[PDB]
Amino acid sequence: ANTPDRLQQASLPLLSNTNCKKYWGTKIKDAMICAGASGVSSCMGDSGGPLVCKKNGAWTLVGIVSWGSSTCSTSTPGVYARVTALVNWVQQTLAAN
Amino acid sequence: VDCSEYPKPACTKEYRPLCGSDNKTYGNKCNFCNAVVESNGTLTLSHFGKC
Amino acid sequence: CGVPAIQPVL
Amino acid sequence: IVNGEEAVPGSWPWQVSLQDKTGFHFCGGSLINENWVVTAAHCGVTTSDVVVAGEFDQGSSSEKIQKLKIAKVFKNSKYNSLTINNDITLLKLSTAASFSQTVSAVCLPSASDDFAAGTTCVTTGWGLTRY
């Protein structure tokens, strides 16, 4: 149980898909975006959570915790679901239902 | 547990804990199976959830 | 959206 | 989060905890409005699970939280388990969340928004601090 009782937060940089491909290579698809490899990492229990960046003083959902290293290596980039690529599917679901 | 698809260099990050017969709690099936291949068969599941 | 009432300290 | 830091109580108001009936957190999530939550498709959320909003300290129970029920789950039809691509699921709450300073929505980008490399962003959650 290396599960923290209180909510954690970590600051990390967005990687360019190519620099990310230097680690994951073939794994990286277009509905994906990397972040991290800077000494911090998302681990088990973090999935589904937010990767937010500022946009005009408003925190914006840029990614969703998805996958990464099997041992949560802080020097490897974590892979998140790229929201801009999925935001239209969301708009249609929201509008429809 | 089906661990034939392992080892795997990458795992998803959901928390669905498994207790190994080694008295260690694995965050999910991906990291439990990964450890089952290290031990080369010697690691088994003692039960689901935290140890 | 995106403007917490309690501001985060990063 | 490995090498994270404790967050200020209530500073990330859209952060939710996905738990089973018995109270076990398995995944995180984000509120995008009062009736919808966005999370990962690999989380495998069902209608018997619960969305806990306004939560900070999981070991406490003096914090006033909201346990919301799921009316429907919308997994992205193009989700591939092989690649973990299109990993997103929308949760349609049966009971709407009440917004306040500790519970509120996150913004969503537009399909054209671009977030450059080297941009410092933030990630939050209750995941393992070590493995």
PDB file of C-alpha atoms in Angstrom:
ATOM      1  CA  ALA A   1       0.000   0.000   0.000  1.00  0.00           C
ATOM      2  CA  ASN A   2       2.126   2.815  -1.326  1.00  0.00           C
ATOM      3  CA  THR A   3      -1.169   4.631  -1.872  1.00  0.00           C
ATOM      4  CA  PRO A   4      -1.229   8.217  -0.519  1.00  0.00           C
ATOM      5  CA  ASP A   5      -4.262   9.209   1.562  1.00  0.00           C
ATOM      6  CA  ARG A   6      -4.151  12.783   0.282  1.00  0.00           C
ATOM      7  CA  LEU A   7      -4.412  13.998  -3.318  1.00  0.00           C
ATOM      8  CA  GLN A   8      -1.026  14.323  -5.048  1.00  0.00           C
ATOM      9  CA  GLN A   9       0.030  16.639  -7.881  1.00  0.00           C
ATOM     10  CA  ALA A  10       3.109  16.735 -10.075  1.00  0.00           C
ATOM     11  CA  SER A  11       4.372  19.226 -12.636  1.00  0.00           C
ATOM     12  CA  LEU A  12       5.802  17.841 -15.877  1.00  0.00           C
ATOM     13  CA  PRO A  13       6.545  18.914 -19.503  1.00  0.00           C
ATOM     14  CA  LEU A  14       4.820  17.897 -22.702  1.00  0.00           C
ATOM     15  CA  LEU A  15       7.042  15.887 -25.026  1.00  0.00           C
ATOM     16  CA  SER A  16       6.939  16.025 -28.791  1.00  0.00           C
ATOM     17  CA  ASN A  17       5.591  12.723 -30.189  1.00  0.00           C
ATOM     18  CA  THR A  18       8.928  12.170 -31.933  1.00  0.00           C
ATOM     19  CA  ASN A  19      11.020  12.575 -28.781  1.00  0.00           C
ATOM     20  CA  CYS A  20       8.466  10.310 -27.215  1.00  0.00           C
ATOM     21  CA  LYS A  21       8.924   7.825 -30.036  1.00  0.00           C
ATOM     22  CA  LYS A  22      12.605   7.576 -28.984  1.00  0.00           C
ATOM     23  CA  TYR A  23      11.272   5.505 -26.077  1.00  0.00           C
ATOM     24  CA  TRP A  24       8.022   3.913 -27.197  1.00  0.00           C
ATOM     25  CA  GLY A  25       8.593   3.905 -30.962  1.00  0.00           C
ATOM     26  CA  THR A  26       5.813   1.943 -32.655  1.00  0.00           C
ATOM     27  CA  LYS A  27       3.562   2.173 -29.544  1.00  0.00           C
ATOM     28  CA  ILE A  28       2.764   5.874 -29.984  1.00  0.00           C
ATOM     29  CA  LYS A  29      -0.400   6.536 -31.976  1.00  0.00           C
ATOM     30  CA  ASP A  30      -2.089   9.832 -32.818  1.00  0.00           C
ATOM     31  CA  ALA A  31      -4.712   9.771 -30.084  1.00  0.00           C
ATOM     32  CA  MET A  32      -1.774   9.756 -27.669  1.00  0.00           C
ATOM     33  CA  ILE A  33       0.435  12.409 -26.070  1.00  0.00           C
ATOM     34  CA  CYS A  34       3.446  12.003 -23.788  1.00  0.00           C
ATOM     35  CA  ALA A  35       4.581  13.908 -20.703  1.00  0.00           C
ATOM     36  CA  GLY A  36       7.130  13.319 -17.977  1.00  0.00           C
ATOM     37  CA  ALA A  37      10.494  11.549 -18.003  1.00  0.00           C
ATOM     38  CA  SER A  38      11.467  14.435 -15.749  1.00  0.00           C
ATOM     39  CA  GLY A  39      11.670  12.622 -12.419  1.00  0.00           C
ATOM     40  CA  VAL A  40       7.917  12.335 -11.844  1.00  0.00           C
ATOM     41  CA  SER A  41       5.464   9.706 -13.065  1.00  0.00           C
ATOM     42  CA  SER A  42       1.874   8.501 -12.898  1.00  0.00           C
ATOM     43  CA  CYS A  43       1.511   5.060 -11.328  1.00  0.00           C
ATOM     44  CA  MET A  44      -1.270   2.532 -10.578  1.00  0.00           C
ATOM     45  CA  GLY A  45      -4.402   4.271  -9.346  1.00  0.00           C
ATOM     46  CA  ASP A  46      -3.768   7.416 -11.406  1.00  0.00           C
ATOM     47  CA  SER A  47      -5.505   6.163 -14.568  1.00  0.00           C
ATOM     48  CA  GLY A  48      -8.429   8.171 -15.875  1.00  0.00           C
ATOM     49  CA  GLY A  49      -7.174  11.276 -14.139  1.00  0.00           C
ATOM     50  CA  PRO A  50      -6.318  14.647 -15.735  1.00  0.00           C
ATOM     51  CA  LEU A  51      -3.247  16.128 -17.438  1.00  0.00           C
ATOM     52  CA  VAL A  52      -4.069  19.845 -17.425  1.00  0.00           C
ATOM     53  CA  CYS A  53      -2.334  22.867 -18.957  1.00  0.00           C
ATOM     54  CA  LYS A  54      -3.144  26.561 -18.682  1.00  0.00           C
ATOM     55  CA  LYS A  55      -4.932  28.263 -21.552  1.00  0.00           C
ATOM     56  CA  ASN A  56      -5.954  31.859 -20.869  1.00  0.00           C
ATOM     57  CA  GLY A  57      -5.899  31.385 -17.121  1.00  0.00           C
ATOM     58  CA  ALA A  58      -8.221  28.388 -17.377  1.00  0.00           C
ATOM     59  CA  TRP A  59      -6.952  24.894 -16.719  1.00  0.00           C
ATOM     60  CA  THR A  60      -7.625  22.790 -19.798  1.00  0.00           C
ATOM     61  CA  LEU A  61      -7.805  18.991 -20.185  1.00  0.00           C
ATOM     62  CA  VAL A  62      -4.963  18.089 -22.516  1.00  0.00           C
ATOM     63  CA  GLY A  63      -4.677  14.418 -21.591  1.00  0.00           C
ATOM     64  CA  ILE A  64      -6.048  11.487 -19.577  1.00  0.00           C
ATOM     65  CA  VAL A  65      -3.766   9.121 -17.645  1.00  0.00           C
ATOM     66  CA  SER A  66      -3.471   6.023 -19.798  1.00  0.00           C
ATOM     67  CA  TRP A  67      -0.313   3.908 -19.722  1.00  0.00           C
ATOM     68  CA  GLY A  68       3.464   3.952 -19.435  1.00  0.00           C
ATOM     69  CA  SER A  69       6.310   2.003 -17.781  1.00  0.00           C
ATOM     70  CA  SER A  70       5.348  -1.200 -15.923  1.00  0.00           C
ATOM     71  CA  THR A  71       7.299  -0.115 -12.825  1.00  0.00           C
ATOM     72  CA  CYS A  72       6.462   3.619 -13.123  1.00  0.00           C
ATOM     73  CA  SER A  73       9.931   4.791 -14.193  1.00  0.00           C
ATOM     74  CA  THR A  74      10.220   8.526 -13.515  1.00  0.00           C
ATOM     75  CA  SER A  75      12.784   8.836 -16.323  1.00  0.00           C
ATOM     76  CA  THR A  76      10.441   7.396 -18.993  1.00  0.00           C
ATOM     77  CA  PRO A  77       7.605   9.430 -20.539  1.00  0.00           C
ATOM     78  CA  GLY A  78       4.077   8.568 -19.529  1.00  0.00           C
ATOM     79  CA  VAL A  79       1.475   8.173 -22.264  1.00  0.00           C
ATOM     80  CA  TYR A  80      -1.879   9.967 -22.007  1.00  0.00           C
ATOM     81  CA  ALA A  81      -4.936   9.928 -24.225  1.00  0.00           C
ATOM     82  CA  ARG A  82      -4.726  13.033 -26.427  1.00  0.00           C
ATOM     83  CA  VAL A  83      -7.960  14.939 -25.818  1.00  0.00           C
ATOM     84  CA  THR A  84      -7.923  17.355 -28.810  1.00  0.00           C
ATOM     85  CA  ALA A  85      -8.030  14.237 -30.994  1.00  0.00           C
ATOM     86  CA  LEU A  86     -11.016  12.867 -29.073  1.00  0.00           C
ATOM     87  CA  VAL A  87     -12.919  16.042 -28.236  1.00  0.00           C
ATOM     88  CA  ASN A  88     -15.279  15.786 -31.250  1.00  0.00           C
ATOM     89  CA  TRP A  89     -16.434  12.306 -30.244  1.00  0.00           C
ATOM     90  CA  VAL A  90     -17.176  13.828 -26.829  1.00  0.00           C
ATOM     91  CA  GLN A  91     -19.164  16.733 -28.273  1.00  0.00           C
ATOM     92  CA  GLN A  92     -21.316  14.361 -30.280  1.00  0.00           C
ATOM     93  CA  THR A  93     -21.913  12.090 -27.286  1.00  0.00           C
ATOM     94  CA  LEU A  94     -22.788  15.043 -25.046  1.00  0.00           C
ATOM     95  CA  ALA A  95     -25.090  16.654 -27.621  1.00  0.00           C
ATOM     96  CA  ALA A  96     -26.789  13.390 -28.602  1.00  0.00           C
ATOM     97  CA  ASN A  97     -27.586  12.129 -25.102  1.00  0.00           C
TER      98      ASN A  97
ATOM     99  CA  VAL B   1      -4.684 -15.480 -14.262  1.00  0.00           C
ATOM    100  CA  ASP B   2      -3.589 -15.593 -17.906  1.00  0.00           C
ATOM    101  CA  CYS B   3      -0.004 -14.397 -18.091  1.00  0.00           C
ATOM    102  CA  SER B   4       0.881 -15.887 -21.487  1.00  0.00           C
ATOM    103  CA  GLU B   5       0.864 -12.453 -23.121  1.00  0.00           C
ATOM    104  CA  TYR B   6       3.699 -11.313 -20.822  1.00  0.00           C
ATOM    105  CA  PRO B   7       6.374  -9.965 -20.230  1.00  0.00           C
ATOM    106  CA  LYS B   8       5.214  -6.458 -21.146  1.00  0.00           C
ATOM    107  CA  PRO B   9       7.424  -3.324 -21.042  1.00  0.00           C
ATOM    108  CA  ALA B  10       4.325  -1.173 -20.544  1.00  0.00           C
ATOM    109  CA  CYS B  11       1.301  -1.360 -18.255  1.00  0.00           C
ATOM    110  CA  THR B  12      -1.841   0.692 -17.847  1.00  0.00           C
ATOM    111  CA  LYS B  13      -2.247   2.474 -14.526  1.00  0.00           C
ATOM    112  CA  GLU B  14      -5.493   1.276 -12.969  1.00  0.00           C
ATOM    113  CA  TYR B  15      -5.517   0.027  -9.380  1.00  0.00           C
ATOM    114  CA  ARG B  16      -6.908  -3.505  -9.223  1.00  0.00           C
ATOM    115  CA  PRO B  17      -4.491  -5.058  -6.611  1.00  0.00           C
ATOM    116  CA  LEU B  18      -3.393  -8.694  -6.415  1.00  0.00           C
ATOM    117  CA  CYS B  19      -1.538 -10.410  -3.540  1.00  0.00           C
ATOM    118  CA  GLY B  20       1.301 -12.667  -4.632  1.00  0.00           C
ATOM    119  CA  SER B  21       2.334 -15.788  -2.728  1.00  0.00           C
ATOM    120  CA  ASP B  22       5.414 -13.667  -1.919  1.00  0.00           C
ATOM    121  CA  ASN B  23       3.333 -11.404   0.339  1.00  0.00           C
ATOM    122  CA  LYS B  24       3.592  -8.489  -2.077  1.00  0.00           C
ATOM    123  CA  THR B  25       0.697  -6.396  -3.393  1.00  0.00           C
ATOM    124  CA  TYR B  26       0.819  -5.830  -7.135  1.00  0.00           C
ATOM    125  CA  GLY B  27      -1.036  -2.753  -8.402  1.00  0.00           C
ATOM    126  CA  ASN B  28      -2.797  -4.672 -11.201  1.00  0.00           C
ATOM    127  CA  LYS B  29      -2.766  -7.772 -13.435  1.00  0.00           C
ATOM    128  CA  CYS B  30      -0.198  -6.312 -15.782  1.00  0.00           C
ATOM    129  CA  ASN B  31       2.467  -5.852 -13.137  1.00  0.00           C
ATOM    130  CA  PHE B  32       1.508  -9.144 -11.423  1.00  0.00           C
ATOM    131  CA  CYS B  33       1.938 -11.145 -14.636  1.00  0.00           C
ATOM    132  CA  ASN B  34       5.174  -9.317 -15.392  1.00  0.00           C
ATOM    133  CA  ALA B  35       6.472 -10.499 -12.019  1.00  0.00           C
ATOM    134  CA  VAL B  36       5.215 -14.055 -12.663  1.00  0.00           C
ATOM    135  CA  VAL B  37       7.590 -14.325 -15.617  1.00  0.00           C
ATOM    136  CA  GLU B  38      10.576 -12.993 -13.635  1.00  0.00           C
ATOM    137  CA  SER B  39      10.193 -15.583 -10.895  1.00  0.00           C
ATOM    138  CA  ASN B  40       9.900 -17.993 -13.850  1.00  0.00           C
ATOM    139  CA  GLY B  41       6.793 -19.754 -12.601  1.00  0.00           C
ATOM    140  CA  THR B  42       7.630 -19.622  -8.875  1.00  0.00           C
ATOM    141  CA  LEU B  43       5.266 -16.710  -8.155  1.00  0.00           C
ATOM    142  CA  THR B  44       1.580 -17.525  -7.725  1.00  0.00           C
ATOM    143  CA  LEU B  45      -1.540 -15.609  -6.730  1.00  0.00           C
ATOM    144  CA  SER B  46      -2.502 -16.106  -3.104  1.00  0.00           C
ATOM    145  CA  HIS B  47      -5.602 -13.905  -3.463  1.00  0.00           C
ATOM    146  CA  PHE B  48      -7.150 -10.778  -5.000  1.00  0.00           C
ATOM    147  CA  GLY B  49      -6.752  -7.422  -3.273  1.00  0.00           C
ATOM    148  CA  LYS B  50      -4.109  -6.031  -0.901  1.00  0.00           C
ATOM    149  CA  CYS B  51      -1.892  -8.521   0.945  1.00  0.00           C
TER     150      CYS B  51
ATOM    151  CA  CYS C   1     -14.555  26.146 -16.288  1.00  0.00           C
ATOM    152  CA  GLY C   2     -10.915  25.667 -15.291  1.00  0.00           C
ATOM    153  CA  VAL C   3     -10.694  28.397 -12.638  1.00  0.00           C
ATOM    154  CA  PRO C   4     -10.545  26.834  -9.171  1.00  0.00           C
ATOM    155  CA  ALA C   5     -11.993  28.954  -6.349  1.00  0.00           C
ATOM    156  CA  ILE C   6      -9.194  27.624  -4.160  1.00  0.00           C
ATOM    157  CA  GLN C   7      -6.003  28.294  -6.113  1.00  0.00           C
ATOM    158  CA  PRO C   8      -3.432  25.483  -6.455  1.00  0.00           C
ATOM    159  CA  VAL C   9       0.066  25.975  -5.099  1.00  0.00           C
ATOM    160  CA  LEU C  10       2.489  24.225  -7.412  1.00  0.00           C
TER     161      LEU C  10
ATOM    162  CA  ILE D   1       2.093   9.675  -8.487  1.00  0.00           C
ATOM    163  CA  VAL D   2       5.791   8.897  -7.946  1.00  0.00           C
ATOM    164  CA  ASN D   3       7.597  11.923  -6.508  1.00  0.00           C
ATOM    165  CA  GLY D   4       4.495  14.069  -6.271  1.00  0.00           C
ATOM    166  CA  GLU D   5       3.532  16.532  -3.559  1.00  0.00           C
ATOM    167  CA  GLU D   6       0.407  16.988  -1.470  1.00  0.00           C
ATOM    168  CA  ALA D   7      -2.069  19.280  -3.176  1.00  0.00           C
ATOM    169  CA  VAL D   8      -3.939  22.140  -1.539  1.00  0.00           C
ATOM    170  CA  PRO D   9      -7.354  20.888  -0.375  1.00  0.00           C
ATOM    171  CA  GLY D  10      -9.947  21.741  -3.047  1.00  0.00           C
ATOM    172  CA  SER D  11      -7.538  23.234  -5.609  1.00  0.00           C
ATOM    173  CA  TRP D  12      -8.391  20.727  -8.405  1.00  0.00           C
ATOM    174  CA  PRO D  13     -12.238  20.718  -8.161  1.00  0.00           C
ATOM    175  CA  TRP D  14     -12.870  18.488 -11.218  1.00  0.00           C
ATOM    176  CA  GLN D  15     -10.824  15.541  -9.853  1.00  0.00           C
ATOM    177  CA  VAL D  16     -13.045  12.550  -9.015  1.00  0.00           C
ATOM    178  CA  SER D  17     -12.417   9.145  -7.532  1.00  0.00           C
ATOM    179  CA  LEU D  18     -13.914   6.093  -9.261  1.00  0.00           C
ATOM    180  CA  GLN D  19     -14.691   3.474  -6.605  1.00  0.00           C
ATOM    181  CA  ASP D  20     -16.574   0.191  -6.426  1.00  0.00           C
ATOM    182  CA  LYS D  21     -19.611  -0.228  -4.175  1.00  0.00           C
ATOM    183  CA  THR D  22     -17.437  -1.267  -1.214  1.00  0.00           C
ATOM    184  CA  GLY D  23     -15.381   1.951  -1.318  1.00  0.00           C
ATOM    185  CA  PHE D  24     -12.246   0.950  -3.235  1.00  0.00           C
ATOM    186  CA  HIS D  25     -10.752   3.559  -5.564  1.00  0.00           C
ATOM    187  CA  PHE D  26      -9.513   2.012  -8.797  1.00  0.00           C
ATOM    188  CA  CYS D  27      -9.205   4.986 -11.124  1.00  0.00           C
ATOM    189  CA  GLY D  28      -9.431   8.767 -11.189  1.00  0.00           C
ATOM    190  CA  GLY D  29     -11.529  11.010 -13.403  1.00  0.00           C
ATOM    191  CA  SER D  30     -12.517  14.570 -14.293  1.00  0.00           C
ATOM    192  CA  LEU D  31     -15.827  16.429 -14.268  1.00  0.00           C
ATOM    193  CA  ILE D  32     -16.432  18.352 -17.513  1.00  0.00           C
ATOM    194  CA  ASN D  33     -19.874  19.585 -16.407  1.00  0.00           C
ATOM    195  CA  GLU D  34     -22.564  18.710 -13.818  1.00  0.00           C
ATOM    196  CA  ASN D  35     -23.745  15.453 -15.422  1.00  0.00           C
ATOM    197  CA  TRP D  36     -20.662  14.175 -17.250  1.00  0.00           C
ATOM    198  CA  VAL D  37     -17.318  12.751 -16.212  1.00  0.00           C
ATOM    199  CA  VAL D  38     -14.455  11.765 -18.527  1.00  0.00           C
ATOM    200  CA  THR D  39     -12.065   8.904 -17.668  1.00  0.00           C
ATOM    201  CA  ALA D  40     -10.051   6.105 -19.329  1.00  0.00           C
ATOM    202  CA  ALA D  41     -11.662   3.287 -21.314  1.00  0.00           C
ATOM    203  CA  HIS D  42      -9.247   0.756 -19.811  1.00  0.00           C
ATOM    204  CA  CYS D  43     -10.679   1.547 -16.342  1.00  0.00           C
ATOM    205  CA  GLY D  44     -13.694  -0.674 -17.102  1.00  0.00           C
ATOM    206  CA  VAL D  45     -16.237   1.450 -15.259  1.00  0.00           C
ATOM    207  CA  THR D  46     -19.770   0.000 -14.884  1.00  0.00           C
ATOM    208  CA  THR D  47     -23.150   1.155 -13.533  1.00  0.00           C
ATOM    209  CA  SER D  48     -22.510  -0.455 -10.136  1.00  0.00           C
ATOM    210  CA  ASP D  49     -19.486   1.810  -9.505  1.00  0.00           C
ATOM    211  CA  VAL D  50     -19.525   5.256  -7.871  1.00  0.00           C
ATOM    212  CA  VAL D  51     -18.132   8.735  -8.618  1.00  0.00           C
ATOM    213  CA  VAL D  52     -16.869  10.432  -5.442  1.00  0.00           C
ATOM    214  CA  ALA D  53     -16.565  14.203  -5.804  1.00  0.00           C
ATOM    215  CA  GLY D  54     -15.160  16.825  -3.395  1.00  0.00           C
ATOM    216  CA  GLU D  55     -12.659  14.326  -1.977  1.00  0.00           C
ATOM    217  CA  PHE D  56      -9.167  15.079  -0.670  1.00  0.00           C
ATOM    218  CA  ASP D  57      -8.088  12.819   2.203  1.00  0.00           C
ATOM    219  CA  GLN D  58      -9.326   9.282   1.637  1.00  0.00           C
ATOM    220  CA  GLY D  59      -8.425   8.310   5.206  1.00  0.00           C
ATOM    221  CA  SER D  60     -10.750  11.042   6.530  1.00  0.00           C
ATOM    222  CA  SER D  61     -14.579  11.237   6.534  1.00  0.00           C
ATOM    223  CA  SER D  62     -15.319  14.693   7.935  1.00  0.00           C
ATOM    224  CA  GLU D  63     -14.853  16.214   4.486  1.00  0.00           C
ATOM    225  CA  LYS D  64     -18.201  16.523   2.815  1.00  0.00           C
ATOM    226  CA  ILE D  65     -18.164  14.552  -0.388  1.00  0.00           C
ATOM    227  CA  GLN D  66     -20.720  13.520  -2.965  1.00  0.00           C
ATOM    228  CA  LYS D  67     -21.170   9.878  -3.999  1.00  0.00           C
ATOM    229  CA  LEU D  68     -22.819  10.033  -7.427  1.00  0.00           C
ATOM    230  CA  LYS D  69     -24.291   7.058  -9.291  1.00  0.00           C
ATOM    231  CA  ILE D  70     -23.629   6.255 -12.961  1.00  0.00           C
ATOM    232  CA  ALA D  71     -26.686   6.013 -15.250  1.00  0.00           C
ATOM    233  CA  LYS D  72     -24.724   5.079 -18.335  1.00  0.00           C
ATOM    234  CA  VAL D  73     -21.222   4.322 -19.567  1.00  0.00           C
ATOM    235  CA  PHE D  74     -19.990   5.460 -22.991  1.00  0.00           C
ATOM    236  CA  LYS D  75     -16.793   3.637 -23.992  1.00  0.00           C
ATOM    237  CA  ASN D  76     -15.186   4.967 -27.186  1.00  0.00           C
ATOM    238  CA  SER D  77     -16.230   2.486 -29.893  1.00  0.00           C
ATOM    239  CA  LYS D  78     -12.817   2.806 -31.534  1.00  0.00           C
ATOM    240  CA  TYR D  79     -10.945   1.714 -28.373  1.00  0.00           C
ATOM    241  CA  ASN D  80      -8.336  -0.971 -29.023  1.00  0.00           C
ATOM    242  CA  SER D  81      -7.090  -2.976 -26.011  1.00  0.00           C
ATOM    243  CA  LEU D  82      -4.118  -4.170 -28.052  1.00  0.00           C
ATOM    244  CA  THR D  83      -2.711  -0.648 -28.445  1.00  0.00           C
ATOM    245  CA  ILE D  84      -4.569   1.268 -25.682  1.00  0.00           C
ATOM    246  CA  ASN D  85      -5.466   3.856 -28.366  1.00  0.00           C
ATOM    247  CA  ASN D  86      -8.641   5.998 -28.037  1.00  0.00           C
ATOM    248  CA  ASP D  87      -8.579   5.348 -24.319  1.00  0.00           C
ATOM    249  CA  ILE D  88     -11.549   7.426 -23.194  1.00  0.00           C
ATOM    250  CA  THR D  89     -14.964   6.740 -21.695  1.00  0.00           C
ATOM    251  CA  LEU D  90     -17.718   9.177 -20.845  1.00  0.00           C
ATOM    252  CA  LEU D  91     -19.731   8.657 -17.683  1.00  0.00           C
ATOM    253  CA  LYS D  92     -23.328   9.862 -17.663  1.00  0.00           C
ATOM    254  CA  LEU D  93     -24.285  10.488 -14.005  1.00  0.00           C
ATOM    255  CA  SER D  94     -27.816   9.588 -12.853  1.00  0.00           C
ATOM    256  CA  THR D  95     -27.586  12.204 -10.132  1.00  0.00           C
ATOM    257  CA  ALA D  96     -26.045  15.578 -10.995  1.00  0.00           C
ATOM    258  CA  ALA D  97     -23.082  16.995  -9.090  1.00  0.00           C
ATOM    259  CA  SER D  98     -23.514  20.197  -7.075  1.00  0.00           C
ATOM    260  CA  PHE D  99     -20.771  22.687  -7.895  1.00  0.00           C
ATOM    261  CA  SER D 100     -18.908  24.799  -5.310  1.00  0.00           C
ATOM    262  CA  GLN D 101     -15.274  25.825  -4.617  1.00  0.00           C
ATOM    263  CA  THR D 102     -14.250  22.210  -4.113  1.00  0.00           C
ATOM    264  CA  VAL D 103     -16.377  20.724  -6.926  1.00  0.00           C
ATOM    265  CA  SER D 104     -16.397  22.259 -10.413  1.00  0.00           C
ATOM    266  CA  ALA D 105     -15.636  21.554 -14.059  1.00  0.00           C
ATOM    267  CA  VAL D 106     -12.435  21.458 -16.105  1.00  0.00           C
ATOM    268  CA  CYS D 107     -12.255  22.978 -19.596  1.00  0.00           C
ATOM    269  CA  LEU D 108     -11.861  20.924 -22.748  1.00  0.00           C
ATOM    270  CA  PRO D 109      -9.729  22.093 -25.694  1.00  0.00           C
ATOM    271  CA  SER D 110     -11.044  22.476 -29.260  1.00  0.00           C
ATOM    272  CA  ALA D 111      -9.892  20.015 -31.922  1.00  0.00           C
ATOM    273  CA  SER D 112      -7.524  22.724 -33.256  1.00  0.00           C
ATOM    274  CA  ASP D 113      -5.823  23.762 -30.008  1.00  0.00           C
ATOM    275  CA  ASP D 114      -2.129  22.963 -29.912  1.00  0.00           C
ATOM    276  CA  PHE D 115      -0.076  22.563 -26.769  1.00  0.00           C
ATOM    277  CA  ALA D 116       3.642  22.884 -27.495  1.00  0.00           C
ATOM    278  CA  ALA D 117       6.438  20.646 -26.305  1.00  0.00           C
ATOM    279  CA  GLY D 118       8.238  21.831 -23.191  1.00  0.00           C
ATOM    280  CA  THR D 119       4.962  23.224 -21.854  1.00  0.00           C
ATOM    281  CA  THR D 120       4.708  22.617 -18.124  1.00  0.00           C
ATOM    282  CA  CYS D 121       1.396  20.962 -17.325  1.00  0.00           C
ATOM    283  CA  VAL D 122       0.062  19.209 -14.213  1.00  0.00           C
ATOM    284  CA  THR D 123      -1.181  15.720 -13.409  1.00  0.00           C
ATOM    285  CA  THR D 124      -3.163  14.744 -10.303  1.00  0.00           C
ATOM    286  CA  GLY D 125      -4.464  11.615  -8.546  1.00  0.00           C
ATOM    287  CA  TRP D 126      -4.377   9.088  -5.699  1.00  0.00           C
ATOM    288  CA  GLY D 127      -2.121   6.511  -7.363  1.00  0.00           C
ATOM    289  CA  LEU D 128       0.897   4.728  -5.912  1.00  0.00           C
ATOM    290  CA  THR D 129       3.735   6.932  -4.684  1.00  0.00           C
ATOM    291  CA  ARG D 130       6.172   4.104  -5.280  1.00  0.00           C
ATOM    292  CA  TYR D 131       6.220   0.711  -6.927  1.00  0.00           C
TER     293      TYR D 131
END
